[PDB]
Amino acid sequence: MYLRITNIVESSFFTKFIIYLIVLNGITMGLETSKTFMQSFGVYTTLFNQIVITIFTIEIILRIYVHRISFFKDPWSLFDFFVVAISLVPTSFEILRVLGVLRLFRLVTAVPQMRKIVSALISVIPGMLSVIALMTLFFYIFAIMATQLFGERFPEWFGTLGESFYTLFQVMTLESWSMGIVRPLMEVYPYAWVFFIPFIFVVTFVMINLVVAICVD
Amino acid sequence: MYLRITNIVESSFFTKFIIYLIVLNGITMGLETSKTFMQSFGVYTTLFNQIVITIFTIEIILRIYVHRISFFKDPWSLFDFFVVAISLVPTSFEILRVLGVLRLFRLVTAVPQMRKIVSALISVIPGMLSVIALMTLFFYIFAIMATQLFGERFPEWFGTLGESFYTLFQVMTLESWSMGIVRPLMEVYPYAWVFFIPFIFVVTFVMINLVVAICVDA
Amino acid sequence: MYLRITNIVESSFFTKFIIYLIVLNGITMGLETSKTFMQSFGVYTTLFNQIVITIFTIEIILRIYVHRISFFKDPWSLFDFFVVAISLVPTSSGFEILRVLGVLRLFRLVTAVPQMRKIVSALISVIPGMLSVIALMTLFFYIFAIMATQLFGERFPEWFGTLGESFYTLFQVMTLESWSMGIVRPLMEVYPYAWVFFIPFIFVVTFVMINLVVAICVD
Amino acid sequence: MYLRITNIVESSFFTKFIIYLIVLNGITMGLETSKTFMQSFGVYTTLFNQIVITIFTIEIILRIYVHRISFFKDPWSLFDFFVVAISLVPTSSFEILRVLGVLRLFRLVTAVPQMRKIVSALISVIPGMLSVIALMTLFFYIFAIMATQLFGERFPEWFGTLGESFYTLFQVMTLESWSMGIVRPLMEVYPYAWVFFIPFIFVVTFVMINLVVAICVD
């Protein structure tokens, strides 16, 4: 019976079908948003999710036996598997349902062309780790400082290695960094800009290089 | 009578005179802006609009007879047709009068060099369709996620897949995303930062490669 | 006697000396910022300023005769010339902003200096390959600045009361600065579909902005 | 004794050990961030800091005698030297050195190699920019000067001093709340103020671009 089921999972019919449910549950998950709607046909819908999830589980279960050890070294179906397993994680923390919406990323898994444009991006990740690790330590060394400078008067923003990491990141984005965060800060600590215009130059400079680093390909 | 209009239509003056009329009315419509202007000379103007509106029909009719099928596979001319039809609709939704202003774009269509710099731009879109579509899926899988997260206390921003799409887009543009959206939210949802800091990395990450792609895809 | 003064103007030191005065006027203009400075040394200071402008007119005049028809074919010296002439114009006859643009003669630093003359000149050469684009933008702006004004100028005169205000506001949206909270979401209170206007504009104007650089790393 | 400390300094483990200890106090200082932590094992900590502060003194003294002048031509070792002396300077009587004590966590880049590199790569890009930077600085200067004696009158918070102007300009340069926050206000009082800031913005933005392509060209 082994060679029987082998024909099912990868038929032209199957993949398009899994894809189909994906776009469907994709849609279906997009409708499960409307409140007007659910009072009319809400039940009609909710079933289909488990359906897709079960099929996607069947798909995910089938995809398992035929490949055996082969299924468990691929990002995509494991993705789907999580995406399915997440989506399989029973209907009641509640985000699995939500990450169940990632099962609409199974669209990325079940559909070609998507798989490619995705993998093309990642190939760039390796050349940046040198830079990223720098950033995280860089942010961290600063997450330590901001906290023990500005946590005095500004506990919302720099009270915590957490909040300082947050607020710093926001300044990195240059979002309300001045009017929203620094000009306030400078009211209490007249010399704060010596921390931030540099933080801004530095992190501004670095981020750029990472890109030139990218345009190495 | 066939071969008559073809030399007119394909004449240097034709190209140059159509272009002439455009620049005329482009000015004219920047004038239809002043209220100061219209209660005095509204008459003189509105007419010239119906005037220009008419000639360009001839041109399009002439260019139609002259190219026949050659015209309606011409983006530049196809555009022309549409951007013409809009302005002809009678004088009273009132937005059409306004869309009547789009007619200043045939200036891109009718003038050489313009057809070209634009075509250069559009031609890049094919290398992007893959990404946009991913984004759109990404945004959607996420506007879905955000909406089935934040619409209770924050119906203004995330009440609808729409405002979520919008807000996400707004967050995407990075305009007031933290002080304005994440920090309020965090007044109520302390770990909201785990949703938006990643969406921000990803939606940003993706946008990046896309540009080196352009500079690299050449 | 012509070649006498001619050899002088083009001396290594002359070049070295004009460059010098620029930096002087550069600084002296920088201390007239402090009221402390002036209430002590308003006398001491203001006097020193007429000195340089005349000299810079002199250089400009010398550079004129020594070069004749050639001087007013020199941007830098013309710059200088105006920058000097700008800097030359009297202290009260009209509007009072002229005293200041003399500070552009501190751009004469860019004019008198060789390595600076260059880096500045390096930037400019990029322009020929882009003119194609800016003009499209400029047009693009015009076509949109027009629409917004006769759309949102009824209710939003601060931002869109005038084709001017619209250009401004459109420009602001372009930078994505407070574009949503500050402008689009407001608009949307009265005109609910405005996002259909701006998301594309934001889509398009941003797009155009991108291609223009690849063109640069192409030139 | 000359040769005794030499194998230690350039040994794999010493390198790994200093490197190791770095990760320790780094964690330790990251815990010196938590107010929570300091009252239980702060002793364990504040002490361990002198522990770390003392051990690391050995290393630099070792590396110095071992390298003598070879030490003070190593940017990387010089930093090591500089960033240590700071951590040694006492607890009283402006209090920020204590805070600067946290910079000794950058030695993780120095003692470790591929970090020494990524740093040098970024730095290497900088020289092709001095021509630019200097212009900026001059440009800013010619412009920061102009602004202060204009708007320090009605808007002294932003432009009362050549300094606040520099700050505000860089803020305008970074484009944060530059419009709603600064120019539109200015225009309520100085109707034509808008003529100054769009140019600084084009230019200073312009300059910044070349600097990238200048970089992406280098």
Side-chain angles (χ1 to χ4, degrees), chain A residues 135-152:
Chain A
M135 295 308 285
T136 297
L137 163 74
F138 181 73
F139 254 69
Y140 181 85
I141 281 181
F142 268 57
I144 282 190
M145 291 183 95
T147 282
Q148 64 183 31
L149 275 181
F150 307 136
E152 207 69 32

PDB file of all heavy atoms in Angstrom, chain A residues 135-152:
ATOM      1  N   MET A 135      25.884  44.992  16.411  1.00  0.00           N
ATOM      2  CA  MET A 135      24.730  45.768  16.792  1.00  0.00           C
ATOM      3  C   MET A 135      24.147  45.381  18.132  1.00  0.00           C
ATOM      4  O   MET A 135      23.952  46.232  19.000  1.00  0.00           O
ATOM      5  CB  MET A 135      23.656  45.627  15.737  1.00  0.00           C
ATOM      6  CG  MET A 135      24.089  46.214  14.455  1.00  0.00           C
ATOM      7  SD  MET A 135      24.630  47.848  14.877  1.00  0.00           S
ATOM      8  CE  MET A 135      23.037  48.619  15.112  1.00  0.00           C
ATOM      9  N   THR A 136      23.832  44.099  18.280  1.00  0.00           N
ATOM     10  CA  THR A 136      23.238  43.610  19.517  1.00  0.00           C
ATOM     11  C   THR A 136      24.116  43.889  20.743  1.00  0.00           C
ATOM     12  O   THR A 136      23.599  44.303  21.778  1.00  0.00           O
ATOM     13  CB  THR A 136      22.934  42.113  19.427  1.00  0.00           C
ATOM     14  OG1 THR A 136      21.956  41.900  18.404  1.00  0.00           O
ATOM     15  CG2 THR A 136      22.392  41.596  20.755  1.00  0.00           C
ATOM     16  N   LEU A 137      25.428  43.679  20.627  1.00  0.00           N
ATOM     17  CA  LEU A 137      26.351  44.041  21.702  1.00  0.00           C
ATOM     18  C   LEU A 137      26.387  45.545  21.830  1.00  0.00           C
ATOM     19  O   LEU A 137      26.360  46.097  22.923  1.00  0.00           O
ATOM     20  CB  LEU A 137      27.757  43.526  21.447  1.00  0.00           C
ATOM     21  CG  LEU A 137      28.836  44.201  22.314  1.00  0.00           C
ATOM     22  CD1 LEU A 137      28.792  43.722  23.758  1.00  0.00           C
ATOM     23  CD2 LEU A 137      30.249  44.024  21.736  1.00  0.00           C
ATOM     24  N   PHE A 138      26.460  46.209  20.690  1.00  0.00           N
ATOM     25  CA  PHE A 138      26.433  47.657  20.675  1.00  0.00           C
ATOM     26  C   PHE A 138      25.185  48.204  21.336  1.00  0.00           C
ATOM     27  O   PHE A 138      25.272  49.052  22.205  1.00  0.00           O
ATOM     28  CB  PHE A 138      26.511  48.171  19.246  1.00  0.00           C
ATOM     29  CG  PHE A 138      26.512  49.652  19.152  1.00  0.00           C
ATOM     30  CD1 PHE A 138      27.617  50.381  19.516  1.00  0.00           C
ATOM     31  CD2 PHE A 138      25.396  50.326  18.699  1.00  0.00           C
ATOM     32  CE1 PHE A 138      27.605  51.777  19.433  1.00  0.00           C
ATOM     33  CE2 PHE A 138      25.382  51.714  18.610  1.00  0.00           C
ATOM     34  CZ  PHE A 138      26.484  52.439  18.977  1.00  0.00           C
ATOM     35  N   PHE A 139      24.022  47.722  20.927  1.00  0.00           N
ATOM     36  CA  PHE A 139      22.778  48.121  21.576  1.00  0.00           C
ATOM     37  C   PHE A 139      22.790  47.833  23.066  1.00  0.00           C
ATOM     38  O   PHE A 139      22.346  48.638  23.875  1.00  0.00           O
ATOM     39  CB  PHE A 139      21.592  47.425  20.936  1.00  0.00           C
ATOM     40  CG  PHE A 139      20.775  48.318  20.083  1.00  0.00           C
ATOM     41  CD1 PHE A 139      21.266  48.808  18.889  1.00  0.00           C
ATOM     42  CD2 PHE A 139      19.532  48.722  20.506  1.00  0.00           C
ATOM     43  CE1 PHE A 139      20.507  49.651  18.112  1.00  0.00           C
ATOM     44  CE2 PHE A 139      18.773  49.569  19.743  1.00  0.00           C
ATOM     45  CZ  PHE A 139      19.258  50.034  18.544  1.00  0.00           C
ATOM     46  N   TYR A 140      23.266  46.646  23.402  1.00  0.00           N
ATOM     47  CA  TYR A 140      23.305  46.168  24.772  1.00  0.00           C
ATOM     48  C   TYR A 140      24.192  47.018  25.673  1.00  0.00           C
ATOM     49  O   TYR A 140      23.794  47.381  26.775  1.00  0.00           O
ATOM     50  CB  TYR A 140      23.783  44.735  24.790  1.00  0.00           C
ATOM     51  CG  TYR A 140      23.822  44.151  26.152  1.00  0.00           C
ATOM     52  CD1 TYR A 140      22.689  43.596  26.722  1.00  0.00           C
ATOM     53  CD2 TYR A 140      24.988  44.170  26.881  1.00  0.00           C
ATOM     54  CE1 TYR A 140      22.732  43.057  27.975  1.00  0.00           C
ATOM     55  CE2 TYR A 140      25.044  43.643  28.134  1.00  0.00           C
ATOM     56  CZ  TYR A 140      23.919  43.085  28.679  1.00  0.00           C
ATOM     57  OH  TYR A 140      24.003  42.550  29.935  1.00  0.00           O
ATOM     58  N   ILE A 141      25.399  47.329  25.205  1.00  0.00           N
ATOM     59  CA  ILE A 141      26.346  48.144  25.972  1.00  0.00           C
ATOM     60  C   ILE A 141      25.709  49.479  26.273  1.00  0.00           C
ATOM     61  O   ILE A 141      25.976  50.099  27.292  1.00  0.00           O
ATOM     62  CB  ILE A 141      27.685  48.357  25.210  1.00  0.00           C
ATOM     63  CG1 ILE A 141      28.575  47.108  25.319  1.00  0.00           C
ATOM     64  CG2 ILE A 141      28.451  49.525  25.773  1.00  0.00           C
ATOM     65  CD1 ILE A 141      29.934  47.210  24.627  1.00  0.00           C
ATOM     66  N   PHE A 142      24.834  49.893  25.369  1.00  0.00           N
ATOM     67  CA  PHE A 142      24.084  51.144  25.458  1.00  0.00           C
ATOM     68  C   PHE A 142      22.776  50.999  26.212  1.00  0.00           C
ATOM     69  O   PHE A 142      22.315  51.934  26.864  1.00  0.00           O
ATOM     70  CB  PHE A 142      23.856  51.706  24.058  1.00  0.00           C
ATOM     71  CG  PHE A 142      24.932  52.647  23.641  1.00  0.00           C
ATOM     72  CD1 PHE A 142      26.246  52.228  23.623  1.00  0.00           C
ATOM     73  CD2 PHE A 142      24.644  53.951  23.289  1.00  0.00           C
ATOM     74  CE1 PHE A 142      27.247  53.095  23.268  1.00  0.00           C
ATOM     75  CE2 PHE A 142      25.647  54.826  22.927  1.00  0.00           C
ATOM     76  CZ  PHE A 142      26.943  54.402  22.923  1.00  0.00           C
ATOM     77  N   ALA A 143      22.149  49.842  26.062  1.00  0.00           N
ATOM     78  CA  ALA A 143      20.984  49.534  26.852  1.00  0.00           C
ATOM     79  C   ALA A 143      21.381  49.602  28.327  1.00  0.00           C
ATOM     80  O   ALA A 143      20.595  50.032  29.171  1.00  0.00           O
ATOM     81  CB  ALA A 143      20.455  48.180  26.492  1.00  0.00           C
ATOM     82  N   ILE A 144      22.611  49.201  28.635  1.00  0.00           N
ATOM     83  CA  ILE A 144      23.111  49.324  30.000  1.00  0.00           C
ATOM     84  C   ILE A 144      23.270  50.786  30.409  1.00  0.00           C
ATOM     85  O   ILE A 144      22.840  51.167  31.490  1.00  0.00           O
ATOM     86  CB  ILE A 144      24.446  48.599  30.186  1.00  0.00           C
ATOM     87  CG1 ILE A 144      24.226  47.093  30.331  1.00  0.00           C
ATOM     88  CG2 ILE A 144      25.154  49.114  31.417  1.00  0.00           C
ATOM     89  CD1 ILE A 144      25.462  46.360  30.741  1.00  0.00           C
ATOM     90  N   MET A 145      23.885  51.603  29.558  1.00  0.00           N
ATOM     91  CA  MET A 145      24.130  53.014  29.899  1.00  0.00           C
ATOM     92  C   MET A 145      22.898  53.915  30.010  1.00  0.00           C
ATOM     93  O   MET A 145      22.753  54.668  30.972  1.00  0.00           O
ATOM     94  CB  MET A 145      25.077  53.653  28.887  1.00  0.00           C
ATOM     95  CG  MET A 145      26.484  53.130  28.965  1.00  0.00           C
ATOM     96  SD  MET A 145      27.649  53.916  27.842  1.00  0.00           S
ATOM     97  CE  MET A 145      28.351  55.149  28.932  1.00  0.00           C
ATOM     98  N   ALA A 146      22.026  53.846  29.015  1.00  0.00           N
ATOM     99  CA  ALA A 146      20.860  54.692  29.010  1.00  0.00           C
ATOM    100  C   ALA A 146      20.119  54.430  30.278  1.00  0.00           C
ATOM    101  O   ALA A 146      19.736  55.360  30.970  1.00  0.00           O
ATOM    102  CB  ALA A 146      19.987  54.417  27.816  1.00  0.00           C
ATOM    103  N   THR A 147      19.984  53.157  30.611  1.00  0.00           N
ATOM    104  CA  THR A 147      19.219  52.787  31.770  1.00  0.00           C
ATOM    105  C   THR A 147      19.777  53.466  32.998  1.00  0.00           C
ATOM    106  O   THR A 147      19.045  54.061  33.777  1.00  0.00           O
ATOM    107  CB  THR A 147      19.237  51.276  31.985  1.00  0.00           C
ATOM    108  OG1 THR A 147      18.331  50.649  31.074  1.00  0.00           O
ATOM    109  CG2 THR A 147      18.813  50.938  33.386  1.00  0.00           C
ATOM    110  N   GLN A 148      21.084  53.454  33.152  1.00  0.00           N
ATOM    111  CA  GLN A 148      21.635  54.022  34.371  1.00  0.00           C
ATOM    112  C   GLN A 148      22.024  55.474  34.222  1.00  0.00           C
ATOM    113  O   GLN A 148      22.857  55.980  34.952  1.00  0.00           O
ATOM    114  CB  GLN A 148      22.796  53.173  34.888  1.00  0.00           C
ATOM    115  CG  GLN A 148      24.011  53.088  34.016  1.00  0.00           C
ATOM    116  CD  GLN A 148      25.035  52.155  34.611  1.00  0.00           C
ATOM    117  OE1 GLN A 148      24.688  51.188  35.297  1.00  0.00           O
ATOM    118  NE2 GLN A 148      26.308  52.439  34.366  1.00  0.00           N
ATOM    119  N   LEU A 149      21.423  56.139  33.258  1.00  0.00           N
ATOM    120  CA  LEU A 149      21.558  57.579  33.153  1.00  0.00           C
ATOM    121  C   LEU A 149      20.209  58.220  33.332  1.00  0.00           C
ATOM    122  O   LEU A 149      20.047  59.174  34.078  1.00  0.00           O
ATOM    123  CB  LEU A 149      22.131  57.967  31.803  1.00  0.00           C
ATOM    124  CG  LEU A 149      23.649  57.937  31.711  1.00  0.00           C
ATOM    125  CD1 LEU A 149      24.105  58.353  30.335  1.00  0.00           C
ATOM    126  CD2 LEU A 149      24.204  58.855  32.753  1.00  0.00           C
ATOM    127  N   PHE A 150      19.228  57.641  32.662  1.00  0.00           N
ATOM    128  CA  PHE A 150      17.985  58.315  32.388  1.00  0.00           C
ATOM    129  C   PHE A 150      16.805  57.622  33.046  1.00  0.00           C
ATOM    130  O   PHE A 150      15.648  57.970  32.831  1.00  0.00           O
ATOM    131  CB  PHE A 150      17.794  58.340  30.889  1.00  0.00           C
ATOM    132  CG  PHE A 150      18.967  58.901  30.141  1.00  0.00           C
ATOM    133  CD1 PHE A 150      19.429  58.286  29.005  1.00  0.00           C
ATOM    134  CD2 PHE A 150      19.605  60.038  30.571  1.00  0.00           C
ATOM    135  CE1 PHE A 150      20.490  58.804  28.321  1.00  0.00           C
ATOM    136  CE2 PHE A 150      20.673  60.556  29.867  1.00  0.00           C
ATOM    137  CZ  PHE A 150      21.108  59.939  28.754  1.00  0.00           C
ATOM    138  N   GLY A 151      17.111  56.608  33.836  1.00  0.00           N
ATOM    139  CA  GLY A 151      16.086  55.825  34.477  1.00  0.00           C
ATOM    140  C   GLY A 151      15.655  56.589  35.701  1.00  0.00           C
ATOM    141  O   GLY A 151      14.632  56.285  36.317  1.00  0.00           O
ATOM    142  N   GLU A 152      16.419  57.627  36.025  1.00  0.00           N
ATOM    143  CA  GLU A 152      16.130  58.454  37.186  1.00  0.00           C
ATOM    144  C   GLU A 152      14.805  59.155  37.021  1.00  0.00           C
ATOM    145  O   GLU A 152      13.848  58.894  37.746  1.00  0.00           O
ATOM    146  CB  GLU A 152      17.229  59.522  37.340  1.00  0.00           C
ATOM    147  CG  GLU A 152      17.521  60.092  38.743  1.00  0.00           C
ATOM    148  CD  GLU A 152      18.171  59.100  39.697  1.00  0.00           C
ATOM    149  OE1 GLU A 152      18.932  58.228  39.221  1.00  0.00           O
ATOM    150  OE2 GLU A 152      17.980  59.238  40.927  1.00  0.00           O
TER     151      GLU A 152
END
